[PDB]
Design a protein around this ligand. Sequence first.
Ligand SMILES: [Mg+2]
Lengths: 367, 251, 378, 165
Amino acid sequence: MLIEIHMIQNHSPANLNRDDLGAPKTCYFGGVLRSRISSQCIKRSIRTSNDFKALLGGVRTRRLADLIQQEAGETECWKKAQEILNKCGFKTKMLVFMSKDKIKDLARIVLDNSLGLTEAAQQVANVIAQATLAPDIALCGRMLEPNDKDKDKKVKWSNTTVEAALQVAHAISTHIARPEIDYFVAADDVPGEDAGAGHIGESMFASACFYKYFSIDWEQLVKNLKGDTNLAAHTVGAFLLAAAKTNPSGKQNSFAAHNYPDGILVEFKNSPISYANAFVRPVSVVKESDLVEQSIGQLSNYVNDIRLGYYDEQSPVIGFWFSPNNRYPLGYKHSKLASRNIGNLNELVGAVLDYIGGFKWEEVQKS
Amino acid sequence: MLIEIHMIQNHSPANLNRDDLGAPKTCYFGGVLRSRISSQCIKRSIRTSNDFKALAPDIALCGRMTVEAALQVAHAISTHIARPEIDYFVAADDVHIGESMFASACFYKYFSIDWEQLVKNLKGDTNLAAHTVGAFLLAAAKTNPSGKQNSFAAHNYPDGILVEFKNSPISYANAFVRPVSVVKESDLVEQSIGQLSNYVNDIRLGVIGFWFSPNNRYPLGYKHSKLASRNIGNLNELVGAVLDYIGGFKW
Amino acid sequence: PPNTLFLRLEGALQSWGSNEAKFALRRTADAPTKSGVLGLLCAAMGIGRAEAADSWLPKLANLRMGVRIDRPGIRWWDFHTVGAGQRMRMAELKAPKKPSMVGAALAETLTPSKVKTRAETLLSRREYLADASFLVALQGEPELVAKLSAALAKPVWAIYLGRKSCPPSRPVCEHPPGFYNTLEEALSAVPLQKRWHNEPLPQILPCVMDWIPGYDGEHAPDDAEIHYDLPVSFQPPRHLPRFVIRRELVVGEDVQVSRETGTSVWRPKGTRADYNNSEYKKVRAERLVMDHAACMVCKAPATTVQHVNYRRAGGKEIPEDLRALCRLCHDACTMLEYGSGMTTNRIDPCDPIWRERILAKRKEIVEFRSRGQRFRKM
Amino acid sequence: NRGTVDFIASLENLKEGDLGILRKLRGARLDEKLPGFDLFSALWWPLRQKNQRAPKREVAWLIAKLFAEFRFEQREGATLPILMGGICRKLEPKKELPRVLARFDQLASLDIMQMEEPLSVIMGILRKHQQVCLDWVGLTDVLSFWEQEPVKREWSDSFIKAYKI
RNA sequence: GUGAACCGGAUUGCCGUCAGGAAAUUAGGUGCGCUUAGCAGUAUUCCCCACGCUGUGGG
Ligand SMILES: [Mg+2]
């Protein structure tokens, strides 16, 4: 089975993702240009959030020898750590994505042994490949490739590939993109000779309402975390809580984009169905409504049409809907698209966890 | 008798099929460049998937090593000018700038099924041939390539199917010689389906066809023309209509 | 009776392989070869692959081949992968010691487990031609052409364009056969068709023709070429060289240009019904008769008419989209629609949900309007 | 096209008070204020009765606002992407040219309801650079079909060709 | 049933930290909307039915 989240959020003028030149990221959907926030930015912000802080047991880095030397008080294990890294096949050094404690303890106890370089390199490769008990590894996956150009021909590598269990698409505006440019000049505190004109810089920004899309596979999440079951549900609840309550950390010091969404639809499938095509037609603001209500109304229309379209009785689907204080109804006219209108995030987490299985949020806060 | 399936679908920003340099696959049509998804992608996309596995089936339909497979899949083609873009991504160290690229387009597809070869490969079985045809219909209506889907979660669902029982195989790709320009009073999908309408309204002036649209969203033809025989509101109902036109057949 | 038939080939992509592909690099030719059309016609009639070599291939190989180039293609390449995630079949078998038992005697002892599998990835790049048009005109016996045309009217098997993924987008059976003495006059007889009104047209249209042997003798000309596309067997393939010449035909003197004969762009319907047409005034008068000249909201006499929806404009006007209201109600519902963007369905004075808004707007109009500005039109 | 020409002529037939009343209604719709609605109706609705291809209510209202604000003289051959392009040469290629170019190319992302302030500042830089002539009819005819690619395709093309001279 | 038939280029990635467009400007100088008009002391009041050679009843 699958767990699916739909999400409608409106943002203040900001720059939550920029390219090399210094402008907001943009896309072309349905023949017109729209603002964009990259998916990987969202996964990074969720991974480094404060509602996910219990759940980082791993590292994605190339400074493994800093971590090995940090697993020491006084013993000089810097040159030998880098050395065994270079005979390992990580030669710029390759980015390695594995758990913290496993590499820390095992590199501390293996690098400090007086054994051969080949055997200790084989053991380091084995413990790097075997340290696949980490939550970000299960959510986001892992691929590592030993560079055979400079690799010793004695030892052999093992299976290391990790299949991920989270699929998030890029954040796409519900309407046309309207880019803007801001001109700044710096000043001098003390008067003096001063400039001729004053070199004008340029800061690009825009504002938009975003439709975000989330998908969670429970079976692969269970299979990646071995025989554990409670950790899967706790990860699902923690990810929902974080993604509901985390923003990208862009230029937030001068563009405070701390808004929170006005509508969350949650769903359960066996097959992934994305509802991004509700906004192929651009949304034109009319005098009556606002951008948010028309966006969720068009989303409701597409949801209603798909629910009355591709629909099999042998596998029926259900879902709950959430809004703050229940101000924005999905079924604006007559349809009851969701059965369990919920006015709070905590009760939504409890309902999702109960639908997964016999789990309570206070129960699984121990793994 | 040949059963021909006409297929219009929109797709979110992603990259399902790429070449050796990584670029989104692209053909040339109508004086400009067209976004392209390979037919040998839809094969091994629908094929060996879990939803489709529902005399031996999946051998008479699609072959393997004089099998004479009775299903033919064509190259999907966009209905507008290809508009590729390149994304800039950086890597962290949590204690250099690359480039990835993507494309977004609405594709027209085309499916053809030989009934006589399917019956001949079934050793005289007929309910199994129609069963495999229905199975391929439900597979093809709900299958995407497994490309860069973890990062670009492209899981869109179709917006119109027209099925034909014509005497000889003929596609409607020549309806998209002129690239589709988006006007304010419409969108991409509506104008694409209208361009499909003003090519089936012709030919007969210058056969039958069953049509389906989900909850009748974008009705075929912008008048009360009988360009399609029947307009239906379910995928199962359209499949049952196809089986019914083949003969007395229950789903 | 007609002596030569006509076939039309067109698709989004096509490929016709040459002799220069004995490995994973498949290159294509500029024109559809003889072997391709022979194979398609064998498919259309429904002859077996083992039967084509027995009194069926040379019978049609005696015909004369003629191709005309309406518009040539752009050379395109597609990257192909074979066997991703699977194990392929390899050709080696163990040495069976004595060389006396080989071939079919050895194949009787073959088992499915005797074969061995290798997991790898076979990469290939295949060339396709984009946006190309061709006409195939084959000159043969009138009975044979009649049989060929009847066969291609309804093909037994499905047909493709060189490779199984290249679909037909124009009918192959579009052109009826005719009687002509030479292949040149036959290729010049079938006209040239345009798709839309403004596009480049080739002033020269190349043609490919078989080299006539003439009288007894008559060695081949210096400008003729060789082509290895005369099929003798198809399983396993056997191919035979042939002589090919090239001729050209200038447009505008022996091939005409046909009109567009259709519409390319789709476009939405006509809004903006005309208010000076006679049908509009007749329908407006009849609707003013029906309502007994009373407003629909406030019941004062009726002077104007509002349009409930704009499904039909100008030519057709059923008097169910029109309601009779007076001046204040017309102006109120007009100002209710300045920035609504509802296009088709407009405001219904019968529906009670608009009444409280409309009356407040009318109160505003009575409160604010200056009559003397409406008169003395500046 | 006929009907436009009489609309621009009736716009030029206006007097001080009418230009001021359309000036005070800048940045607003029409349905809020009743004298503006009545003046626009008396100036526009007979043309829509007689001619079918008379300008839409929104585009006519917007063009009336811009004419009341700027009051340019009507003359054929003084269209906007020519004067833009004849003006752009007199600026520094390093700094001011991208600044003017960005404000000019921002129009391809805005709607007719949202195209009052960029047009206001563009005619502002005209009035700053001492121009008195402008083709209003061409601007109305391109705004009425502003949502088509060839119209803005010939927009900046007239620009490029005037700028390259 | 065609140099054809069988045929996924696939797995990995935060653009994140730095900035006052600022100093100064009267839109002032002149103009009559002016000469005209009973809702009543009449001589046919647009249509229909009924009764006599004007009186009831309905639009
Ligand atoms: Mg009224």
